Assembly symmetry: C3
Homo-oligomer: 36 residues x 3
């Protein structure tokens, strides 16, 4: 249905934003190793 | 069209789930370096 | 609205593709550490 598509998109947007944060945290740890 | 939007969302959900797995695998390698 | 859903999906697709690239760049740095 239409409303179910709405909510699926919103969930995918939120999951991608959580993955962006998780990658930023990994990048921080990697850079500590790379320069230390 | 409507059905093409349906299938695009499903593909984006699946691609994001593959990226979540890929990040988990990287995190595993990073943690090995970080503590070894 | 319908057209706003269209554009939101397209933005989410593009953001996920940018995250895929960012993860590939991190993987490259991690592999340099892992084998060097
Ligand atoms: Zn660096
Ligand atoms: Zn994503
Ligand atoms: Zn650790
Ligand atoms: Zn390796």
């Amino acid at each position: 249905e239409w409303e179910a598509l709405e909510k699926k998109l919103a969930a995918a947007e939120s999951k991608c934003q959580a993955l962006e944060k998780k990658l930023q945290a990994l990048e921080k740890k990697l850079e500590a190793l790379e320069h230390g």
